[PDB]
Design a binder for these strands. Structure first.
Ligand SMILES: [Mg+2]
Ligand SMILES: [Zn+2]
Ligand SMILES: [Zn+2]
Lengths: 79, 49, 48, 1336
RNA sequence: GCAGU
DNA sequence: CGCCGCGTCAGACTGCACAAAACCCTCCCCTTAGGGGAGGGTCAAGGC
DNA sequence: GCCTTGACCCTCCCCTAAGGGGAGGGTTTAGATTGTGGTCTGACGCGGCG
């Protein structure tokens, strides 16, 4: 779990952009078929989001390129 | 009220900032148990239906 | 939580269906305000 | 969806286009069956169906056929919700003036027609005629007529001319007028008018006419011919359960309007006499004007409770209007409330939430988790399960709150730490358990305080509660960068008792292998917590590379500090606990840990500090008995000595030696001396009564008395209360403030008798009433500051500016009040700070001054740093993140998107409830230095200052100033300039009671027009030995020498006119009236001695400084730099003129000579030098000395109020409000731009217009900035939603309507009103996306 | 109106 | 310019208890009969 | 040795038309009637008179 978010704010250079990126990733994990990149230790999707931010596994650029990738793969099914 | 035996000492922060620590023997002996009576009214009216 | 009448029912059905997401609209007090300013002789609007 | 809110006037076509039918009848509903009556105020045919998808005859009942207009009754078949949206209208039989555009001053109908409001109110109350068209007649177009004058005009001119009365006449006048022609005619007669008052009237009329021609408005729309009817679900007529109905006052007012209107149509059909139809038109006008704004014209209409009816304007304005009561704050779902208790077992991020509160606050979460986990088949089954409170819904509730923060709030929310997030821990009580360390943030004690709990629903709301608002992120204050999650009374007392030392304590002198052995000894009872001992301590310091390097040393410690060392994180030194830890030492411990190690170790340290302080205060048994309040045994004899002394002053009064005034003052001073003696004897008895034995020898130590241990900790109390417990409680005041001459010679350990107790209640209730009546003043100041500053967001990273204020330490007279460190800490520098040894930059140009850089600034002796401020930020519509500096709550440079104006307003107005309602002697060593100098040497060897504003600083051996005094004009200075002094000696002396005129240069007397008997009265007196003379008053002169001012000038015995060295203009001394000369003709006085003598706070102060109000008699500052001369006299105002030789000289002033003027006619002045003395007006400072000068003035005068009460507030927060105050400008030269001379424009608009003009070569406008008060600047924003929401809704809405304004929802209040993301914070990215995608 | 913070 | 008259403002949360008449004439609602329609009851044929 | 699709007859329910009565809107009265009823706020800004 998280008691202070200071490690995530050092990777994402703001608190407001941190809130936005973590809300986007937590909405991916909560309503959506996406799976966490860290072991879910009985945490809610907000804390799993912040723990993925803290480890450097997720930021706005990674989220954007992953969206581009899954959208291009879903559009690749031209049949 | 009631003549409670008090001690003026800080006790593990449970009387921090004007809080009161109370022993269980005040709840056992029913010292500050107070009876409260409430009237509740059920008014059968004449509706237009 | 107060005023978005179509929005608070959607919020309840989204909290119940496991989706913590809001779809906020215009608070109904603002529509009351636009209707009360227009009942004076004043034309207040929303532009787009 | 929409990007702006346009306000305008409503055409009758626009009013008929909104409406869904005309309300012809005043019927509300039918009395037998409560169906709404046809053509009425509640009409299902007009306003929509009263039930969902059901016409009022019931012929159509389902949404099978929706949108169907029934033929049996005309009711559409649609939702009943359309009764909240569908307006109606009333066709007024007579045109009726809108009351807002007639009566809210200045009258728009009056300002537009160039007609006084008395004339218009007489025309539209049918008391006079008005000639709407003159024709070939002497009658002009605005010529009012009486009835008989109109009859005479009809005799002489017949049916040629046109004259009318009533609002039909006003409407014909507004309709017949031509706007562009009259606008250009007014511009012509404004170019040829030089009368400033007529120019003001003309420019306001021109701006009104051009605001009409630029918007789509027509003037005659200000006269209502159609009246709108509010939808009936917004003025509802609802049946109460008791059979009775409940209506809004709007139905009564509308029903009155329709009754009078239908009766007017009746009378117009019956061809009634003109008296009756005139009276009916007047009644219809007053009924419509009572509908729109009740009480605005004359007597308010009161119905059926003898209470005034609430009109349409009262719905939207005031503290109970829509804008403040329903749109800016509102009742909120998912919110609970309960009493707060301690719960000292919690971590800093946890609250205790009752299970029965959390089961209701999280009900849909539990319903959804019961549906999901299969434990309930339905939401009805889950609702029944939560209602029965099965054992499984508590496991579900433990699941749904796990990482889900809640916001806890204690109203009044004075600042942003009055709302903090916490993770809930389910407890079984009914009271919330609020962590102790956050109580000081909430201003919450557990004596009955309640707090509201709010649940953040969305993932964004939960992530802001966790990232922005959680109490672990909130350990610094945003007002000053100091810790606010800080230990307090029990904690401080525990840590103080643990960290003290006793002399012969149990287990003294042994040597320990570390803190763990010390804890072992203490818990085993083998050593006391205060035994001075030798502990092997390992401490880590952060090396220059950044890691922790160890060192192990035997520290002379006590057992308790060794124990406390076990909780101190690693990068801190041992000197941080090796002392008796009071409140400030603990706060410094936490601040050091935050700066050195960071937030994550600091929250752990804070919780551990709280636990160990609570624990060792519990083990302390620290208790207050009655013997703890030791009264000094010298109290009775000190009081008897003071009683004897006041008895001797009483016999000196009885023997007439002293007047009752000096008797009263001497009795007061010899009672205050006795009070200070008693207090000093008490504290000297109380602080060191512990004398105890070390190896037999007695030895005094600091007292372990509990009252002293609480006071000395800073846990609770100060010596101001210990003095009332064990000393005496001294002189009390009367209710008016005059202190009673006999004091309370008792304390609270002894009794106060009946009279002493009554005398003390005098001041007790005064303090209580001021507390109860100044919260409503500090809250109003905070509201005004918030609504002036709300829209200031940090919107950039750098504006690249090079301006900034020169920060210096605050030296009030002899002592410093704020060093340079706490004034520049967190700023960015504006220029390269360089060492006193030049040519090597100490701190580079654009550097953020964090604590290491400030340590570098105090290693060297730099005392003036030019830093960047928000008053000098080049960013338009916001502030760059460099001109602000540090975010005081986080400790780094501020982020882009921070709403700094709301933070500044809260940080200023939060301490508002802590506010209320001759010769110089250098104190220590240093080298004196005088500035603004004009100096000569006297006959004796003094140094004589012939200058007005010369100021004497003490430059020390390092260059920094340690005291700064004001030496007056003509004061003799015992030392030179740059001479060392002794601590406590005098440097400058002067005459306090009179102003001397001093000799410029040695010379001889010439009495030029110093006429004896006409300008000179000779006086005689014995004890002087030499006769004197007086230059005459204005009211004592005969005809003569007041017009030719008598002068005393310099000559030689040569007969040569010796003059000033360097110039050849005639040196003079123009002695004004009320002066003294004891010198005869031809006497010789050298340069440096006198020639003649002339005799002479709190919360409202902050509120007056921010409202920028002009003081009673302000200092008259010199406008331009020139030389002094004088014109006309004795019209009540002497005529000063200041002439610069190097330009257009004459600038003349009208100073009234009842003010003692402060400059002579010979010297040259500059802009800002006080011609007369007094409290400076800030407008004059801004005008003459600049923007940084009024900034410095306001921040110094505000911090002066805030530093008396010991309130730390960073100056950023006052500079934000100052920037928002000087936000307008006036055009002095229109330039090649679209502005007019003398109009007030937004300063950012004129700045960017000048920029885009200079980009195309054309020269831009030139302006003069304005200083508005926080109210006059809140109301003058370019956004009418914020201004109408703030206060004076009616004026703002009429100005915005007749101006055809537009509001782009750019600040924070306009986005809170409409329910959008605010443009600051996590809604700043959204608005950048929205304005970069709605722009292209 | 009367209390609580 | 001095002065008088007028408009605007005055903290935030909580509970508690609470608020002339008489006669004519037409029109709408209640009641009841009717009639149409809209299911409901019990079988007659192959198909399953 | 057991399931659809009609088939005919039976039963009740909702809409419609009319008739009685309560309700509700309307019109007219002729001895003389002639002008109605709290004040407990202070500070500040502004704007029109004089
Ligand atoms: Mg309290
Ligand atoms: Zn219908
Ligand atoms: Zn800047």
């Amino acid at each position: 779990a998280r008691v202070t978010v200071q490690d995530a704010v050092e990777k994402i250079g703001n608190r407001f952009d941190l809130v936005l990126v973590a809300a986007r990733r937590a909405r991916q994990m909560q309503v959506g078929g996406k799976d966490p990149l860290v072991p879910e230790e009985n945490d809610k999707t907000t804390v799993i989001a912040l723990r993925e931010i803290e480890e450097g596994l997720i930021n706005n650029q990674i989220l954007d390129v992953r969206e581009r990738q899954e959208q291009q793969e879903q559009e690749a099914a031209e049949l | 009220g009631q003549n409670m035996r008090v001690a003026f000492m800080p006790w593990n922060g449970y009387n921090f900032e004007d809080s009161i620590l109370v022993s269980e023997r005040v709840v056992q002996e029913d010292r500050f148990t107070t009876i409260h009576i409430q009237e509740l009214a059920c008014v059968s009216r004449d509706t237009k239906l | 939580k107060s005023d978005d009448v179509n929005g608070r029912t959607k919020m309840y059905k989204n909290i119940v269906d496991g989706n913590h997401q809001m779809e906020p609209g215009m608070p109904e007090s603002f529509n009351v305000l636009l209707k009360e300013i227009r009942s004076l002789g004043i034309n207040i609007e929303l532009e787009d | 969806e929409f990007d702006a809110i346009k306000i305008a006037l409503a055409s009758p076509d626009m009013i008929r286009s909104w409406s869904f039918g005309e309300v012809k009848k005043p019927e509300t509903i039918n009395y037998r069956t409560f169906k709404p009556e046809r053509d009425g105020l509640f009409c299902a045919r007009i306003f929509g169906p009263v039930k969902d998808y059901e016409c009022l005859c019931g012929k159509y009942k389902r949404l099978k056929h929706r949108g169907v207009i029934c033929e049996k009754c005309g009711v559409e078949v649609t939702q009943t919700k359309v009764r909240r949206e569908r307006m109606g209208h009333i066709e007024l039989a007579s045109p009726t003036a809108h009351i807002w555009f007639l009566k809210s001053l200045p009258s728009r109908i009056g300002l537009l027609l160039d007609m006084p409001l008395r004339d218009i109110e007489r025309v539209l109350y049918f008391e006079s005629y008005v000639v709407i068209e003159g024709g070939m007649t002497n009658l002009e177009r605005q010529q009012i007529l009486t009835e008989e004058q109109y009859l005479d005009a009809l005799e002489e001119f017949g049916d040629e001319f046109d004259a009318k009365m009533g609002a039909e006449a006003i409407q014909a006048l507004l309709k017949s007028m031509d706007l562009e022609q009259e606008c250009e005619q007014l511009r012509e007669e404004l170019n040829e008018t030089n009368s400033e008052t007529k120019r003001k009237k003309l420019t306001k009329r021109i701006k009104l006419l051009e605001a009409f021609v630029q918007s789509g408005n027509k003037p005659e729309w200000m006269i209502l011919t159609v009246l709108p009817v509010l939808p009936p679900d917004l003025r509802p007529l609802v049946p109460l359960d008791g059979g009775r109905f409940a209506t809004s006052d709007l139905n009564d007012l509308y029903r009155r309007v329709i009754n009078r209107n239908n009766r007017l149509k009746r009378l117009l059909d019956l061809a009634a006499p003109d008296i009756i139809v005139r009276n009916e038109k007047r009644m219809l006008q007053e009924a419509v004007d009572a509908l729109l704004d009740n009480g605005r014209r004359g007597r308010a209409i009161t119905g059926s409770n003898k209470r005034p009816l609430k009109s349409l304007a009262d719905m939207i304005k005031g503290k109970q209007g829509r804008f403040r009561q329903n749109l800016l704050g509102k009742r909120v779902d998912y919110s609970g409330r309960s009493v707060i208790t301690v719960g000292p077992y919690l971590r800093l991020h946890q609250c205790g939430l009752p299970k029965k509160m959390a089961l209701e606050l999280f009900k849909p979460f539990i319903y959804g988790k019961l549906e999901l986990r299969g434990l309930a088949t339905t939401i009805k089954a889950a609702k029944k399960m939560v209602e029965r409170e099965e054992a499984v819904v508590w496991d579900i509730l433990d699941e749904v709150i796990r990482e889900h923060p809640v916001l806890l709030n204690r109203a009044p929310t004075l600042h942003r730490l009055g709302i903090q997030a916490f993770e809930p821990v389910l407890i079984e009580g009914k009271a919330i358990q609020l962590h102790p360390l956050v109580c000081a943030a909430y201003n919450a004690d557990f004596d009955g305080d309640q707090m509201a709990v709010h649940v953040p629903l969305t993932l964004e709301a939960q992530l802001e509660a966790r990232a922005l608002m959680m109490s672990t992120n909130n350990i610094l204050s945003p007002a000053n960068g100091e810790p606010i999650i800080v230990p307090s009374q029990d904690v401080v007392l525990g840590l103080y008792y643990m960290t003290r030392d006793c002399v012969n304590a149990k287990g003294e002198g042994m040597v320990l292998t570390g803190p763990k052995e010390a804890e072992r000894l203490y818990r085993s009872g083998l050593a006391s917590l205060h035994a001075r001992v030798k502990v092997r301590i390992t401490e880590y310091e952060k090396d220059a590379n950044g890691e922790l390097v160890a060192k192990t040393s035997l520290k002379d410690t006590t057992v308790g500090r060794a124990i406390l060392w076990m909780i101190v994180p690693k990068g801190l030194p041992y000197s941080i606990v090796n002392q008796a830890l009071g409140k400030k030492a603990i706060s410094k411990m936490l601040n050091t840990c935050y700066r050195i190690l960071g937030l994550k170790p600091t929250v752990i340290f804070a919780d551990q500090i709280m636990y160990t302080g609570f624990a060792y205060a519990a083990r302390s048994g620290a208790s207050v008995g009655i013997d703890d309040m030791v009264i000094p045994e010298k109290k009775h004899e000190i009081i008897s000595e003071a009683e004897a002394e006041v008895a001797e002053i009483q016999e000196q009064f009885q023997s007439g030696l002293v007047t009752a005034g000096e008797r009263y003052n001497k009795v007061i001073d010899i009672w205050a001396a006795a009070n200070d003696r008693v207090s000093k004897a008490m504290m000297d008895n109380l602080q060191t009564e512990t004398v105890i034995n070390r190896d037999g020898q007695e030895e005094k130590q600091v007292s372990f008395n509990s009252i002293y241990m609480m006071a000395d900790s800073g846990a609770r109390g100060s010596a101001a209360q210990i003095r009332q417990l064990a000393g005496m409680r001294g002189l009390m005041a009367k209710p008016d403030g005059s202190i009673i001459e006999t004091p309370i010679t008792a304390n609270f350990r002894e009794g106060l008798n009946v009279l002493q107790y009554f005398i003390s209640t005098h001041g007790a209730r005064k303090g209580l009433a001021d507390t109860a009546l100044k919260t409503a003043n500090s809250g109003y100041l905070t509201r005004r500051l918030v609504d002036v500053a709300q829209d200031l967001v940090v919107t950039e990273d750098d504006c690249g500016t090079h301006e900034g204020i020169m920060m210096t330490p605050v030296i009030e007279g002899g002592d410093v009040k704020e060093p340079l460190r706490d004034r520049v800490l967190g700023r960015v520098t504006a220029e390269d700070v360089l060492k006193p040894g030049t040519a090597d930059i100490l701190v580079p140009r654009n550097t953020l001054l964090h604590e290491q850089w400030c340590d570098l600034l105090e290693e060297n002796s730099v005392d003036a740093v030019k830093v960047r401020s928000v008053v000098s930020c080049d960013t338009d519509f916001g502030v760059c993140a460099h001109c602000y500096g540090r975010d005081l709550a986080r400790g780094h440079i501020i982020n882009k998107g921070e709403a700094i104006g709301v933070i500044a307003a809260q940080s200023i107005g939060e301490p508002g409830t802590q506010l209320t309602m001759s010769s110089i002697q250098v104190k220590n060593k240093g080298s004196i230095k005088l500035s603004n100098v004009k100096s000569v040497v006297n006959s004796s060897g003094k140094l004589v200052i012939t200058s007005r504003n010369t100021e004497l600083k003490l430059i020390d051996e390092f260059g920094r100033t340690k005291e700064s005094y004001k030496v007056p004009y003509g004061a003799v200075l015992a030392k030179g300039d740059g001479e060392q002094v002794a601590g406590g000696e005098t440097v400058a002396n002067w005459d306090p009671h009179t102003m001397p005129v001093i000799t410029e240069v040695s010379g001889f007397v010439r009495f030029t027009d110093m006429i004896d008997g006409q300008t000179i009265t000779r006086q005689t007196d014995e004890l002087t030995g030499l006769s004197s003379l007086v230059v005459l008053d204005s009211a004592e002169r005969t005809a003569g020498g007041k017009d030719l001012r008598p002068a005393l000038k310099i000559v030689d015995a040569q007969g040569n006119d010796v003059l000033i060295p360097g110039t050849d203009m005639p040196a003079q001394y123009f002695l004004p009236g009320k002066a003294i000369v004891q010198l005869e003709d031809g006497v010789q006085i050298s340069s440096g001695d006198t020639l003649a003598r002339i005799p002479q706070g709190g919360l409202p102060r902050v509120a007056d400084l921010f409202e920028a109000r002009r003081p009673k008699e302000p200092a008259i500052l010199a406008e331009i730099s020139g030389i002094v001369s004088f014109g006309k006299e004795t019209k009540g105002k002497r005529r000063l003129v200041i002439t610069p030789v190097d330009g257009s000289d004459p600038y003349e002033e009208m100073i009234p000579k009842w003010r003692q003027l402060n400059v002579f006619e010979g010297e040259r002045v500059e802009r800002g030098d006080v011609i007369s003395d007094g409290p400076e007006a800030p407008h004059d400072i801004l005008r003459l000395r600049g923007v940084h000068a009024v900034t410095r003035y306001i921040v110094n005068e505000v911090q002066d109020v805030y530093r008396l009460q010991g309130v730390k507030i960073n100056d950023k927060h006052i500079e934000v409000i100052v920037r928002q105050m000087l936000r307008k400008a006036t055009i002095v030269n229109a330039g090649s731009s679209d502005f007019l001379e003398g109009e007030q424009v937004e300063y950012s608009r004129v700045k960017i217009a000048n920029r885009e003009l200079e980009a195309n070569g054309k020269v831009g406008a030139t302006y003069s900035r304005d200083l508005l008060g926080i109210t006059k600047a809140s109301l003058a924003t370019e956004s009418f939603i914020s201004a109408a929401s703030f206060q004076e809704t009616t004026r703002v809405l009429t100005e915005a309507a007749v101006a055809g304004k537009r509001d782009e929802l750019r600040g924070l209040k306009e986005n809170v009103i409409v329910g959008r993301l605010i443009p600051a914070g996590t809604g700043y990215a959204y608005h950048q996306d929205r304005m970069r995608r709605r722009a292209a």
